[PDB]
Amino acid sequence: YFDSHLHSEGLGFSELVKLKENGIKEVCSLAFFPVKPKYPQTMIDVFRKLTEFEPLRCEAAGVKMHPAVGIHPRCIPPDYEFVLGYLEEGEWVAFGEIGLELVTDEEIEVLKSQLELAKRMDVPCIIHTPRGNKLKATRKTLEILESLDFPADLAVIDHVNFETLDMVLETEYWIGLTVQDAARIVAEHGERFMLNSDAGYRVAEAAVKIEEAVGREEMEKVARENARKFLRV
Amino acid sequence: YFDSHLHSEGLGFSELVKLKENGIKEVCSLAFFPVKPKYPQTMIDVFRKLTEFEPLRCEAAGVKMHPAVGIHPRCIPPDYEFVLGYLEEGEWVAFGEIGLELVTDEEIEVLKSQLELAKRMDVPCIIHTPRGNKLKATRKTLEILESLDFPADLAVIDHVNFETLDMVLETEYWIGLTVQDAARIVAEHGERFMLNSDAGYRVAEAAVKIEEAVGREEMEKVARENARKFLRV
Ligand SMILES: [Zn+2]
Ligand SMILES: [Zn+2]
């Protein structure tokens, strides 16, 4: 199986191995600092740790982790410009955890600057939808994403809640279904979906609980291992 | 039950709660970056995360974590000078994970510079003893620690293995007994000891398995909650 969006730096080896033995043998960990950086260079190191240490720490437990890098809105360092430079260099698998939160202009810039660069490197993005204005925010996101004419195959709206699944559907981007509740199975009415537990720092087995609830069986293989097409693997 | 030396940034909430329910309701997490920094400022943020986020993440699971800051030898950033400045400012509970590894002069300087400053702030230190030359190294450490005339109540040699417990005894510093094996109980022949599981990124319940093995009972309260005197709390 496979589980996009899952913060590794917030999981212990024990928790990790629980994934190995449950089917979740493939995950996509995204960059995220549980506190706002004082220096933009920090992110770089969080990246170094995320792509040179985490994958081993994971495979050693029996899980093939696919790292993702970027800059979460809740931790935008001052000279965020400094973090896009290092990025525009090294080759990447995908831009993880990026988006808007308080619709601040600061996010828009840090968000745009990234999704923009992403278009020049043809690398996927996992935009994140806020928990607060998960409807007033996704609009703006889906609005920013609109202008750049971002290809409907390089972005995935995540945390697509029950009362907004219509909004993102009016688009051609991929929709991420986070189980965290479990009544998302019925949301299979239609096929640009992906199951993600989003196992963070705070249980960590939802990308299979409902990933299996689908009595529709077989077909389901495109909600669990459909994130491999998006994530080119 | 208290457990000094325990890397939090490498534990999951699940793993954390296991501590809460086993007696280990008090721990001392130390700073450590699983990869060598590219910038000295990174450390600062790892500190920010370690003293403004980790303690909550822990108490939310039922454990009172006592953060410790410093610079591990296996992750000495270039301008390490930059990390001692920020340190000589904010107030601290203790200097965690510092020491020598390859006896390099670079460590000696990063190690000395710290233990030195520590003497000016009267803050405890948890020196770490290498796994390789755990005998050729601890000597130098115990040698550096000698010159500075470091008070025998502000430092604790850790990972004091069975074949070196005599070396550090010839001193007045505190000895840290890491269970990781469990045949350390017999090492109670004498009372400057502390049980530490050292639960890192890679199970995490040794500061009680042997912390209880002591049939000597009662007295034991000075091997489990004797780290409270050293950490002053
Ligand atoms: Zn998110
Ligand atoms: Zn997330």
Ligand SMILES: [Zn+2]
């Ligand atoms: Zn150590």
Ligand SMILES: [Zn+2]
């Ligand atoms: Zn350690």
